[PDB]
Each structure stands twice: as C-alpha cells, then as structure tokens.
Amino acid sequence: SMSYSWTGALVTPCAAEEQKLPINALSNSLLRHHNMVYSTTSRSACQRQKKVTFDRLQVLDSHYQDVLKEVKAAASKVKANLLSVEEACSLTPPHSARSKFGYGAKDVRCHARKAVTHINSVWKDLLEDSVTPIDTTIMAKNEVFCVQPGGRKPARLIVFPDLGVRVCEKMALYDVVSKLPQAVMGSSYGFQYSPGQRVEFLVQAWKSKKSPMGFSYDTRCFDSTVTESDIRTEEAIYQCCDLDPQARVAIKSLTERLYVGGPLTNSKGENCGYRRCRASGVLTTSCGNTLTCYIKARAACRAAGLQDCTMLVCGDDLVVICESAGVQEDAASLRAFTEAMTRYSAPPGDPPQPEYDLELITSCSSNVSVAHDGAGKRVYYLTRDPTTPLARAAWETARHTPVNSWLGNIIMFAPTLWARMILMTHFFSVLIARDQLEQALDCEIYGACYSIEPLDLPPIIQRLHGLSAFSLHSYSPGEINRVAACLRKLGVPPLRAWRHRARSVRAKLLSRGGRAAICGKYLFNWAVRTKLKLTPIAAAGQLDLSGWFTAGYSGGDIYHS
C-alpha cells in the first residue's frame, strides 16, 4: 500500500506566508544574519509530498506478536472515561484552526451554542456511521530554520480533521491517550519525565551497564511508515481498556473513518489525494506513534540479539542503551535491528551507529552534557544545538506568533549555557521594553499548549531541573564550542556581550520587587561575581504542575490550564 496517492492539486495556503526573517531592531539585537533565517511555506509542499510517498511492505513475526500480547495484557488493566463536551471544549487551544461549519476555537472554548450543536451532531454521526471516511485538511507548516547549504528544508505537512471532529476525539480518547501509554510501556515511555527526570533516566541506564553501548534509531518519515494494520492494531489495544459503551463505538468509528486513512482536501476545497498512513494532526498521533515505535523496537531488539536493553520512546524518537557484545558484534546487531525495523515497515533515514559515550547519542534533538555546581560536583543536563531555537526566537521577537517556542525552550533547556545567557537575557529585556513582563504567553511542553507567566520561570525551573540550574558553571569545551560557532554563524552577539546586558536586565528586575526580583536574583546570578545565596524557592512547592509530564500530545490540539 502507498502511504499517499495524489491528484496533482497543490497544497495551498490560507493566508500570506512571510518567507524571510523581517528586520526589526529588537530581533536584530539577538540575531543579525537575517538572510540565513527562513520560514517554510506551501511553495515547497511538492518536495515534501514526494518524500513522504512510498510503498510499505510489512512482514510481522513472532517477536512482534509476543510484544503486542504484552502490550494488550497491560492495556487490559487500564480504565478510561469519556470526557463531556464541556471538558473537551476546555482542552481546545485558543488558536485552534476554525471549523468549516461557521465557528472557531473561541466559540468552542466559551461553549457557544453554534459550536456545541455542531459538535453534538458530529458525535451522533460517529455513533451512527462507522465506515464513511472523514474529510481532512492538508496544510504546509510554517516553521523557522537557519539555512544549511541543500539550502532550505521543504515544509512539513499537517493533516487534520475539522474542529468539530477534534472535540469529539477528545471526548472519546483524551483519557485513553493520557493513561494508556505509560501503563503499557512503563519506564520506557518518555513523556512521563520532566527534563531532570529524563536526564536521570538516561544517565542511570548508561551507568548500570558493565560496558554500555547505545544508539538512536531514525525512522525515515515515520508517519508514512505507519500502516493501516498498525492503526487497527492501535484500536485493538485501546479496546483492551475498560471503556464506556459509547466510547467503544466512537473509537472504532474514528479508527475506521479517520485514523486508518481518508481524503486530503486543500484550503481551497480541492481534492489533493488520499492518505493510508498516520495523520499528523489527530489526537492519537503521539500515543499511536509511541506505541507503534515501542512495539516494533522492542521486537527488533529481540531480533537483533541486543543484550539487556533499556529503551526510551517519545513518538517516533527511539533511544536504546544496552550491554556491548564487542565492537564487531555490536555493529552486526545494529544491522540486524535495522533489518527487523525495516521488515516491520520502519526503515531508517540515517543508519544507526553504535555509540560508546552517552553524550554522542541524540534523542529528541538533545544530548546529555555535564557542567558543575558551585562545589565542583558534576551535574548532568540535556542540551541541543541552539541554532533552531535562536532562529525561532528572533522570528518570535519580530512577529507575534500564537505559540512561542522561545518560552518552551527556556523551560526545557533552562540549565544550558545558551538558554541562560542568551534566551533569558534577550527575552526579559524585550518583555521589559514592551511592558509585557506580567503577561502570560502560550508555549508548548511535550506538544500540549500552556499559558505560562514568564515571572513564574524560577520556580518552574527549580521543579523541572533542580536548584542547581541557577548555579551551573564550567560547561564542557565541546558544548562551549558548539554554542560559540552557532553565534558566529547567525550573527548573534558573543556570550560576554550577553553577560554585560544581563547585568542591566538583572538590576531592572531586582528593582521591581516580587516575582520580578526573584527572576533577577535566580535567573541572572551567573552574570555577577558577587553572588546572592540561592535558597529553595518557596513558590516551587506550591506550583500545580499536574499533567505537565503525563503524556505527549504533539499534533493533538491540546491546551492545558
């Protein structure tokens, strides 16, 4: 079966799409080489369509079936509930795509009668029709990157059903996709961990091995590798739970009418083609991808003869750490792993490489690195190449965007050199300049949208990373070099310039008192030689962070609050 078939109609925009980073004084103060920063647009959709379109050959075997049985057995212990229309409405993001039926996200969030009447009709139709494919829209994502001269990445494609259907997905499946993944994959389910917990997991997994070896496995176009049988298997797993009778009907209908495939319509209403793989923009994308990746990977580890594996799975992202059998044996085992994954429909982009140092493994864009606290104690933390974060931060300074990656990056990468010295300094300075310090902003954590107050960053950071996040120094030479080269590449001022700026920002924050002063004291202690004593933040204990690290929701149109 082909992942997609196409009619020749274009993937079309629904508004003008700005291509190049605009010139703005505040954005330019972060990053000057604006010609190297671009947004993907519908203009490159054809290139992406070509890449994501291929035939899937899938052959399953006894290891695969053995793992599937384990998963179904674990699922049978789960109880999940329906959400009410009101509950589902409250999970809809404020800038969720408008319905084609005359209402938008705001109407959903305020339980407007036109929205609710339509939602109720969609629900009824799910209960009454289990077969007619549901329409989806195909759009080109507008995402910002820095050039790497094949130059520019083509746009990723998002495929999503109508707003009314999305609310019904929440009613049928929000509780399932929030509970089931952790229950059936246990410690391997990556989205249950804060950043601090994720680094603890990876480090302990590595340390526990006599002679560790690890790798990341990069499936080429994972969504396109997911077969109709994969998606029906997911449905069978969902049905192992104790569910409400109406949920069972809706879940089957959603599977058969939406998740397994369906027609692709552009923003002009034209038929673009037909999908027989994973939809990138449905509630079950993260759960389904994670389950499918886990099942295939766990089976493939057995096929590969890998010894004492520890896996960490987040959607299509897979890390395995295991006991080395020797260099040639390990290399052969990774070839066998790849052959198994390939048989299961998931061949690699880049072939996996065995790594014998933890820092060399990249997972969810990130690698483990080490710094030191004030007493010379090694502290592990997750970092990443800052290029994309910085490029997006510059864009988000020049233009108002619905969701701010910069805030998510500060939250998730708070212990890093670059988040601390550059992102914190820049954004506190911009927020002060624009008189926006007190304003909550939308960002994403594991794909769910949150409204977060920047003045709450210090206790958030303490909870996610530990108090040491405000005291790290003596970073690794390789990390320092990577950041430095990024700054030269992008025309970002050097770190010592940011330090000078941070001293001013800090004094301004301290002068304001309250939460602002806590931001000055804790976030910018690094910028002064005469340091303040950083004691545990009282507010940290009081923060309700329930649901932050429960499940992944990228593509699933979820808002938490």
Ligand SMILES: C=C(C)COc1ccc([C@H]2C3=C(CC(C)(C)CS3(=O)=O)Nc3c(O)cccc3N2C(=O)c2nc(C)oc2C)c(F)c1
């Ligand atoms: C704890 C760590 C420090 C390391 O582990 C992480 C770190 C971050 C995420 C979140 C996020 C990001 C950007 C952020 C921070 C700005 C927001 S985020 O937390 O949602 N990036 C990434 C990646 O760069 C790579 C993979 C997945 C995601 N993420 C997704 O959820 C996601 N899934 C899809 C299909 O696409 C995306 C963007 C994650 F899941 C795991």
